[PDB]
Each structure stands twice: as structure tokens, then as C-alpha cells.
Ligand binder design. Structure first.
Ligand code: SF4
Ligand code: SF4
Ligand code: FES
Ligand code: FES
Lengths: 633, 633
């Protein structure tokens, strides 16, 4: 089973699924082979009813689409649609939170409130919203209106782009016409320009894609900002991960999806319902996380993470998962069918994300506590039905230190230099103790043995003294393999990095180092890494494309990951992707995305499926940046 | 060549292309055969990097997508994306016109102005915008702001839906949650919900698709409204169509695309440049139309239509097309390559729609006259280079009477009943002289011999006394085969329909009938048919799903046509489509779209590729509606 997942708990559940005849994501992948090479290379178009059009990568006809669309146009249009779809997800998440904040401060949703008043005021100041003499509720109402205004054209550009990057970077992007005019405006313009008989120049198409990726960035940053106002900015926390966090004698409730607007409430209400669970014969309610909603409550409340991404079905296979509470994004719809075999109650909560055969509970912010209790009572009912039945929870878990928001990272650094907190980090970049920074982001993908690229690359970078930060299911992969346990610093980290992690941790009263990898949160919280990198650029007086900072979507799957990778390139980072995106059918598109975009934004994609080779390429990118700053490497 | 096109001028140019070795859309189609059956049936998904996933329609594995997405989810997600892409095009067109009107009334674009002040005031009244005591420029500024506001969420729903359909229809749609909250909001929500791991219930997905189709309707209606304010509401006009409208001794300039914001200016400026053209050895500038921008200037100014849709390359093959001036949508990008052989200067004008190898002229409303003169001077240069060369313009054209805006139709009817203009039409529906109404809409499609479905269906309906109206390239197909020439009324029309067309025409001072088919304009001007049908419903006191009105996208191609067909169903019409949409791989989706949606909106799709059978099915739908109103049939 090691060829499917490198996670030993997942392997154990794959054996259980096999002997019980439960079909998994890996079985469905095997049944798909061999996959279509036209789609894999990007040489397929279905944008009108004259299609499908395909193009043979080499040889004889077909060589061009029916309407005349070339291989490079077809490849660029498909890629742009993926970017727009990703932007639509991250910004739909952000839009929902903006409406939640507006309802809260207008007295329409008493379960929600301004929890981080400091963050509220800093965001207002960053946006140019006056705070002196204003009530918090009025400032927040203005912030929520500004968030909603960024979805459409107005007299200013998207402020969740222009106010979050340094003026020099905004100037570069503006010169190329890349600043978004409105988030949903850009998504719609992509769908228009890529429709039949519209944009048919690969460079023009890809420039539109870069601009739409910045609309995705704006949605990510807005989502983090609003979630922090509503639910609190993360600070360091200690918890656990992997399937062993499930407890046979408790009501096990997974929160799964991305938007934690209800799942933050689930966490608090579940505490109130201890006694009701105890009356049912359970020790209590054990809330666990899956995917990014799990990251959100891990970051803010220390909720343990049960599993992530490709292996999500395995939590159900234990037999102990009483409920899976779903919002949207990255939920395999197979869960609704597997639930018939495993007994789990799968519950959807968002109007636009339902799954046939799953129970739906309308969630409304105005009734959030009431909805939570109804949902948790279904979970309690499910626990009762399995009283007495054996379960198979693998006794496998790791320790996870997390909660490294950018505010938390700055505060940790400020223990070494109170009035200039970024300086200790820059000092160690300059002296070589920190070679550079790598952000791991994105998903697992069934084509890659689960976690193998994240861990193989992370190990090589850590040995070379790279400061590694992680979000999303990249953070999930690293946490499940021990990369967030400070006890593994000695094994994993080069001497210089160990010295820095130890110096920071000792100054924070820990008696021990920071963990080998800093967990910066969910997928939208890739925006936190942007905030840190922008602050470093501002402090050094250089643009982001001069910093020794790279990104790696080492096992990417979702359209959201394509959008993130593209905005990482657009803000100026060398950006690795470890699965093939559908671009290899066009050499001109590949050349733009891996080479000539350097001349536009300073960033570029590094496509590399072999993880040892990818780590070498990422280190070369970091070291090239070091050389450009005159640093040793 | 008759198997490729039923248009004799197109056949002549296909022979010329063949002997000159110029590859056409039909050659590129032949080179694509056999096409992929997974894509044709809808059983392919590329929404994440685990794909492509396909599903065998019958037999053995694969049976389900890798993530667990069923055939019905995959089919519904793909369809929803097509609807959103169509909505993005029609509403991008409308958004551009809203910005043009705003610039005009703020003194920023002197080439544009309020030409239809009556239409402006009626729209303002329909929207609830006060007009008493207000300057026209202020009313128009308010209308343009309202148009822009409908793209995003606000305290009202999309007013270009709720103010254009009768309250009873709005109530039905509201009860099912189908009223759009904002145009670009719905497009983004579709892209979100159809991304991996999000909506996975076919009924829920398709209801979202119906709502997004109404965002498309709003964009169509807004585009017609704003184009009428800026450029004038159409009134009846007489002109010609087909390749014989090109003139060997003139500078022939085609306007091609959809948004006539510059091409209306091209028409006026070309008149000013007669003498400059005459100095070059030409008789003048002969502006001709292709596709919907051609329809726009045909409707408003009588500009002759040269060709449409699938046969657009053939205008270039004549050797006489000096320039092709492009905005966006439905332009085969092959034109940029064919131009090397034919000498035509292909010019793009919109930032988001460029074609490699075509000259780009930045158009800006603020410089519209200056841009037009630069473009027309390139055309004049091109004419000079072909002085002396023979050309092959087929001597084939038809007479076209057009300009039937809904205002024009009401005014024509008012000559029979001044104070109750709809009553003469209803009278003849009730007595059987008019059996019903059919709207022909949409594109040609290379899979169908060009125009064969439109003409075969139209002939059968006209013989059965159906009032036939047409837009877009459906109007193009019918005009090129004589269906807009009143001289063909005797041959084509049943006795009852002939009596009505004759009575209306005689009362309008014509001495002869209205044409066999009423040309209601461009693709966005499908909204004019909605306005007429809604007015009829309001006058009869019934909802639209009780009227004997149907639609036929008989040769559909573009994502825009999928969106139009879907909103035709959503507002309550039986809606034929004559090419296979990618739904046959899912019986449950097909059943929803062809059967159970009747219980939701009262409309339904009729999928039928054989045109004689399609006409029988459309007549059965009309006659079922007649029976429900207690009428003979
Ligand atoms: S848009 Fe062009 S390439 Fe795509 S399916 Fe239609 S004809 Fe084929
Ligand atoms: S979304 Fe599901 S069905 Fe579509 S490509 Fe990804 S795994 Fe396959
Ligand atoms: S031919 Fe397989 S993805 Fe289209
Ligand atoms: S397998 Fe051919 S369209 Fe995807």
C-alpha cells in the first residue's frame, strides 16, 4: 500500500477498505488508466458545440481546432479558466465572510462579533478608513462594505491587491496592466475572453490570467483578514494530527471544507453539548479537522487534524466517524456513498454545495447556534447506533505545533529585537543561517504517492537551511509526517536553521526550538505568507523578485492551486509545481510560463515531477536570488 | 459542396478555396473526425489535475470520476460552466455599453450621445428612476449606474430580470430561488460550485444553472436597452444580404463581432471618408456586416449583411475584402491566417480579444473618430494594393427587410388598433390565423450543413401559420435564403399567416405584406423577443408558460447559445436545440432538462437533430399551448 500513500495510518485503512470491498480514490484512479493524453497535455477544447477538438502533440492531423484555434490558444484558454475557477472559490469564501461580518455588526447575527479589534483597526488603517472617534461597529461596517466593493468595478482598483503589496510591486504590475479592477469582474472577463471566437493570442490570454490570479490573491487576503476579525488572529498552539486523534468512546465529528463560518461555531457549541453527549454514553464530543476548515480551527483553537485531501475517505473507514460536517471545496463526493457502508452521517450546510445522498442542514448565520445543535444531535444519534461495535482507529498520530500567523511570527521575532522585529530574520538570511524561504502550498494528488513530494523536497531544503512555511494540505502532509514537532529539529534541520529556530524559541520561553516547519494556516492564509514576504521586501527596500523566497505546490490538484501558483509567479516568486499542469502540449505557452514571464513579473514556474530534482531546482532558484543580493551561498 | 453549406455563394467560395489550397472550417472539421465521444456526450471532466476523468457511456469501467463525481454531476457541471461563459460574454458586452453611456453623459466621449431620449425615459420609468424635472444627462447617468449596479450584490436583485418579466413569472422564479443577485456574482458562483469537491447534486447544480441563465438574460436586455439609447431604437429598414453585397470597385470593410460601440462609429465615419476613398481610385467605402455587429448596423442603418457564422472565411476568399474590423465573440481565429493568402487587413480593437498575426488598433470611446479614421485608412491602403487584380465575388444576394424592434412591431400593429396595439396580434392567435410564435436564435455549426435546419424548420412552421421571428445568425440564415423578402410570402406562408402579414403591411402604407420572418436583431436582441412575449402575457393576464410561443436554436454552437436556450426554458418556453449538447451521457440530467423542469418553470428543452422531426415537435408544443388556452388547433 506504500505506492498509494506514504502515511502509515492511511495504508492501514486501505487494507481495511480492500478486505471490506469499499472502493477508494486510488481504486477509481486505477480504473481510469490509461488517462486521456489530449486532456493531460492541454490539447483538448470543448468551448463550443463544434467540439470536442483535440490536437495531436506530434505527427499528423488534427493539428488545429475547427475554428482555427491553435495549440497555444487552446492551452492558454484552458489554463485561464482554471485560474478563474480558483479565484471564484477563494473569493466566494471571502464574500461569505464579508456578509457574515456585516450581519454581525448590524445586529443580525448575534453568534458572530468583532473578536480581533486590533486587527480590525489595522485593516481599516491599511485601507484608508478613518478610525479616530469611530465606534468599532461602524469601522467594521465600513471594512465589510470595502470588502464587498472589491468584487466589482469602482473608482479604485481592488484594494485587497493594491494596499497589500509594496508600491514598487504595484507599479510593476500596473505598468503591465495586471492590477484587477474587481474580483468577480475579472472572473467574468476570463470566461468571456476564453469563449469561442474571442481572445486568440497566447501572450494576451496569459496576461489576463495573471491579472485574474491577482483577483484570487485578493480573495485569499480578504478571507484571512475577515476570518481574523471574526474569529481571532492565530497565535501558537499545540495539538496532534492523523487518524489516531479519533476516539472510539467519543462522538467523533469532522469539520471538512474551507469556510469555517459554521465550523468555528461547531467548536464552541460542541463544548456546550458535553453533558448531552455524556448522557448518550459518550465521553463527549471530539471535533476533528479535515482539509482547510480543519486548518482554520486547528490554527485558532488547537482542534486536532484527522486527515487531509486525497486520504479523506480513510477517516470514515475507521468506523468511528459519527459525522462529517461539510461546507465547500475539496470534498470528494464519494463520501456520501461510503457513508452507507461506514455509518457516518455526512451533512452538507451550504446552499450551493450539496451531495446526493447526504443530509442537508440549512445553515444561516442568524441561526448558527440552533443549526449547530441540530447537526451535533445527528452526530450523537449516530454514535448511539455504533455503541458496542468494534472500530479500527490506527493508533498513529503526530504532535503538531502551529498557529504561526504573520502577527505571531513577528511577535516571536520581536523577542530578539523589540523595535525592529524583522531584522533578526534578515540578519540570518544575510549571514547564511537561513538560506531562503520556501512556502509549501496546495493539495495531495492521487497521481503522486501521498505526501511523497512534500516530504522529499522539504527534507532536502531543511538540510540546506531553508526556512520552510506551509499552508493547506501541504501543511497537512508535513504535520502528519512529524515536520511540525520541535522534537524533530535535530534530525531534519541544517545547523544554521537549527540555530535560528532554537534562538527564537528560547527567547519565547520555550526551552526548545520552533518547529522545523511553520504552519501559516489554510489555503486562503497563503495570504499570510504574502504579508510576511511583503514586509520583508519593504524592510529591505527591494521588490519581492529580489528576495530568496520560493513556493512549491508539490502535489497540486485543485483549480485553486493553479490560481495560487499563478499569483505566486505574478508577485515575483519562483514557483514549483510537482504535477503536470495541462500546458505541455504547447511549447510557446510553456516557454512563457517558465521563462519569459521572468521579464514581466520576475517570477516563473518550475515544472518538475521528480521531487529530488525539484529540490535541486528550488535551491538553485534561492541561490540565484542570494547572488543577486550579493550574499554568500 | 452542398453537403457543407446550402448557401450557393458559400459553395462557390468553397470551390475557390479548394483550388487555391486554402484550408477552411469544413476542412478542419473533416481532419477532426472521428471526434471524441466522451466529450460529445459530456462524460469528460478536467476540473482538477487528477484528471482527465472520463466515463464510458455503457459497459465496463471507468464508471465514476476519480473524486467520486458521477456521470450526472460531471454532465451538470460542464453544462453550468457553458451557461456561465455565455452569461460572461453577453453581459461583458452590456457592461462595455454601460461604461460608454456613462462616459458620454459626463463629457468624456463626445462621439457618443443620447440618441433615443424616449427609450431613456421609458427605461428609467421601468427601473423606478425619477424623470420629472431631471436633465436627460442626469437620468442617463442614473440609468448607467443602475446597469453597472446589477453586476454585483446590492439591496435589490438584478433589476434587468425583475423589472422585465411580469410579476407572476418573477414570483414563480423567486419561489424556486432562481432570481439572480448580481450578474458577475452568479458567474463566479457557478465557477465556484462546479470546481472540484463542491456541488455534487445534479438538481442543485442545474437550478444554479437556471439562475445563471437569467443573469445572461439580464445582460442581453441591458445590452439592447443601452445600445438603443446610444445608437437609436431600430425601425423597419430595407437592405440586402450575402456575398454579392461586396463591390469590386469599392473599399470593402466588414464589421464583425458583437459589440457595435465602434462599428456604429465606423458606419458614420466611413461616410465622411468617401472623398479620401475616391482619391484612392475607389467608388467609396462599402461597409458590410458579418455576424451580430453586422446585425446591429443592419437593424439601425440598413448596412448590408455579407455573411455569418460558419461561412465567415468565405468573404475573404473573394479577394475583395479589404478590411475585417473585429471586436469580440464568434470570430474564427483562422481569419488571421487566411488574410495572408487573401490580402485582407484583419484588425482587432478590444484589449481582451486579440489574434496572433492580426493588426491591433486600440479603440477608446474618447478617441473613437480618430480610431475609425486610422482603421479606414488601413482599409484604403489595402484596396490600392489590389487595384487591377481580378476578384471572385459571387453575384448572389437577397433582399432583406428588417428593423423589427419590439417598439417597431407594436407601432406596426397600432395601425390596426391605435389604443390597444397588441390586440390585433392576439385576435389572430385566437382565431387561428397565427398558430403561434417561434423565435429562431443562435449560430450555424459545422456539424450541420449550413442553414439546413433553420430553413427546413422555418418552412414547415410558416406553412402551418406560425409567426416566425429571428435573431443573430438564425436571422442570418433565414435572410440569406430569402425569408426576409416580402416577395416570398406567397410561396412560404400558410393562408392565415399571409392574411395577417398582408393586413399589417397594408395598414403601414406598404401595398404589400410584412416579410415572412421578422428580424428582431442581434443575439442580445433576443431580449426584444422577451419584451414582446412578456407584453403579450401581461395583456392576456397569463404567465409566459401558457403562451403558444416556442424557441429553436436549430444549429447552435456557442456557449452563448446554451445560455440563451437555458433562459428560454427558465422563462417558460419549449426550446428546441438542433445540435447535441453534451448531456446524453446522463439520463437523469437529460430527464431534468427535457421533462421535470416543466414542473419548475413550465419550459423545457426539445433535443432533436432531424429538422423535419424537430418541426413536428415544435408544432406539437405550440398546439399543446393552444389547447391549454382553449383555442382550436
Ligand atoms: S472553440 Fe474552437 S477549438 Fe474549441 S471546441 Fe469550438 S471549434 Fe473546437
Ligand atoms: S474534479 Fe473529479 S471527475 Fe473532475 S478531473 Fe478532478 S477527480 Fe476527475
Ligand atoms: S479528448 Fe480526452 S480530454 Fe478531450
Ligand atoms: S476524453 Fe475526449 S473530451 Fe476528454
Amino acid at each position: 500500500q506504500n505506492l498509494k500513500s506514504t502515511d502509515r495510518a492511511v495504508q492501514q485503512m486501505l487494507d481495511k477498505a480492500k478486505r471490506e470491498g469499499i472502493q477508494t480514490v486510488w481504486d477509481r484512479y486505477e480504473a481510469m488508466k490509461p488517462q486521456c493524453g489530449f486532456g493531460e497535455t492541454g490539447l483538448c477544447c470543448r468551448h463550443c458545440l463544434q467540439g470536442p477538438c483535440r490536437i495531436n502533440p506530434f505527427g499528423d492531423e488534427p493539428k488545429v481546432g475547427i475554428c482555427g484555434a491553435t495549440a497555444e490558444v487552446i492551452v492558454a484558454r484552458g489554463l485561464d479558466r482554471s485560474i478563474a475557477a480558483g479565484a471564484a472559490g477563494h473569493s466566494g469564501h471571502a464574500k461569505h465572510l464579508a456578509h457574515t461580518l456585516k450581519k454581525a455588526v448590524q445586529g443580525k447575527a448575534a453568534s458572530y462579533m468583532i473578536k480581533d479589534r486590533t486587527k480590525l483597526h489595522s485593516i481599516a488603517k491599511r485601507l484608508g478608513i478613518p478610525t479616530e472617534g469611530q465606534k468599532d461597529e461602524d469601522i467594521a461596517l465600513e471594512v465589510a462594505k470595502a470588502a464587498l466593493a472589491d468584487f466589482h468595478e469602482k473608482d479604485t482598483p481592488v484594494l485587497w491587491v493594491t494596499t497589500v503589496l509594496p508600491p514598487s510591486r504595484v507599479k510593476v504590475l500596473s505598468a503591465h496592466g495586471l492590477i484587477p479592477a474587481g474580483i468577480d469582474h475579472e472572473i467574468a472577463e476570463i470566461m468571456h475572453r476564453t469563449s469561442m471566437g474571442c481572445d486568440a493570442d497566447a501572450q494576451n490570454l496569459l496576461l489576463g490570467g495573471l491579472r485574474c490570479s491577482l483577483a484570487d490573491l485578493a480573495g485569499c487576503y480578504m478571507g484571512t483578514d475577515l476570518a481574523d476579525i471574526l474569529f481571532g488572529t492565530p497565535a501558537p498552539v499545540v495539538t496532534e494530527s492523523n487518524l489516531g486523534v479519533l476516539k472510539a468512546d467519543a462522538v467523533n465529528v469532522a469539520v471538512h471544507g474551507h469556510n469555517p463560518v459554521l465550523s468555528d461555531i461547531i467548536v464552541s457549541v460542541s463544548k456546550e453539548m458535553e453533558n448531552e453527549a455524556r448522557a448518550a454514553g459518550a465521553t463527549g464530543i471530539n471535533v476533528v479537522g479535515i482539509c482547510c476548515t480543519g486548518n482554520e480551527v486547528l490554527m485558532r483553537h488547537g482542534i486536532p487534524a484527522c486527515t487531509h485531501s486525497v486520504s479523506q475517505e480513510m477517516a470514515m473507514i475507521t468506523g468511528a466517524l459519527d459525522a462529517m460536517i461539510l461546507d465547500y471545496q475539496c470534498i470528494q463526493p464519494s463520501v456520501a456513498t461510503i457513508a452507507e457502508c461506514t455509518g457516518t452521517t455526512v451533512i452538507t450546510t451550504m446552499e450551493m454545495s450539496k451531495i446526493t445522498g447526504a443530509t442537508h442542514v440549512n445553515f444561516a448565520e442568524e441561526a448558527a447556534v440552533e443549526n449547530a445543535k441540530q447537526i451535533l444531535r445527528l452526530a450523537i444519534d449516530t454514535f448511539k447506533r455504533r455503541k458496542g461495535k468494534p472500530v479500527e482507529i490506527p493508533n498513529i498520530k503526530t504532535k503538531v505545533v502551529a498557529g504561526f500567523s504573520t502577527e505571531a511570527i513577528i511577535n516571536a521575532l520581536s523577542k530578539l529585537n523589540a523595535n525592529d522585529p524583522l531584522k533578526p530574520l534578515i540578519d540570518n538570511v544575510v549571514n547564511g543561517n537561513i538560506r531562503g524561504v520556501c512556502l509549501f502550498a496546495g493539495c495531495n494528488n492521487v497521481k503522486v504517492p501521498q505526501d511523497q513530494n512534500f516530504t522529499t523536497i522539504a527534507r532536502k531544503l531543511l538540510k540546506q537551511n531553508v526556512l520552510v512555511v506551509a499552508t493547506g494540505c501541504g501543511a497537512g502532509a508535513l504535520m502528519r509526517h512529524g515536520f511540525m514537532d520541535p522534537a524533530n529539529v535535530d534530525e531534519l534541520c541544517g545547523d544554521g536553521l537549527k540555530a535560528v529556530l532554537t534562538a527564537i524559541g528560547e527567547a519565547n520561553g520555550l526551552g526548545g526550538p520552533l518547529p522545523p516547519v511553520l504552519h501559516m494556516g489554510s489555503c486562503v492564509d497563503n495570504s499570510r505568507a504574502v504579508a510576511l514576504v511583503a514586509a520583508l521586501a519593504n524592510r529591505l527596500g527591494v521588490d519581492l523578485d529580489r528576495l530568496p523566497v520560493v513556493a512549491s505546490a508539490a502535489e497540486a490538484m485543485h483549480e485553486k492551486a493553479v490560481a495560487i501558483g499563478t499569483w505566486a509567479v505574478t508577485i515575483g516568486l519562483p514557483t514549483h509545481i510537482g504535477v503536470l499542469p495541462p500546458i505541455t502540449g504547447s511549447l510557446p505557452v510553456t516557454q512563457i510560463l517558465t521563462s519569459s514571464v521572468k521579464d514581466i513579473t520576475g517570477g516563473y514556474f518550475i515544472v518538475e515531477l521528480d521531487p529530488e530534482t525539484a529540490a535541486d531546482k528550488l535551491l538553485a532558484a534561492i541561490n540565484e536570488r542570494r547572488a543577486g543580493l550579493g550574499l554568500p551561498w
